[PDB]
Amino acid sequence: IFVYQNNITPSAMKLVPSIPPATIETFNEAALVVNITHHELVPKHIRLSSDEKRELLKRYRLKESQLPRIQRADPVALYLGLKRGEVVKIIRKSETSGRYASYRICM
């Protein structure tokens, strides 16, 4: 986890994607002065293990691309720190059943 006061020169961020499998993540304090998830329009987000994701695919008979998507550059995606090919279960407070489940793919 790396936090910068202000701008990063590209020379100091060209080699961020070096040394796999170690991953480096960047953040502004301005982007971190307020917790995003505590906003009431943002529902609960949780992470899926690869096993239960595979279970989900086998149950709903999808193939891996028919899920609704979510950007890598999304704020909640960056908050969770997930990467490509991961599934986020979303619990939001519906109005016709109260509690409702949904999933997204980080592609």
Binding site: L41, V42, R69
Partner: protein, 112 residues
């Protein structure tokens, strides 16, 4: 939160007068407009430039240009779409089309 705010906005507009429509229709509109990871206006280009059937996509007034793109990219159209099945004249898998009607020799035997 984007789609929640959007649903709030559309409900506000359509409920300023002439309320109300049921919730589920509005929710479906919001969801099909937001199910790409990002906002997608229903324009001549917005939802139209998806990986969707060339025939329905040329049913929406960018016709010869999008057919040229389809011919150049040489892609295949799956014909699971209503418009495709209409312009090809087959019964779409819709409502009454959503299944098949299969004979049963076994029950035919059993009911002399």
């Amino acid at each position: 939160a984007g789609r929640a705010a959007l649903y709030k906005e559309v409900y506000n507009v359509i409920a300023s007068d002439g309320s109300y429509v049921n919730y589920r229709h509005m929710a479906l509109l919001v969801d099909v407009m937001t199910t790409q990871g990002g906002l997608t206006s229903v324009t001549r280009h917005g939802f139209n430039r998806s990986n969707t059937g060339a025939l329905m996509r040329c049913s929406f007034e960018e016709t010869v240009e999008i057919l040229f793109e389809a011919g150049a990219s040489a892609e295949l159209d799956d014909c699971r779409g209503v418009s495709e099945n209409v312009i090809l004249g087959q019964m779409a898998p819709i409502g009454t089309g959503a299944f098949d009607v299969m004979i049963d020799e076994e029950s035919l035997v059993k009911y002399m």
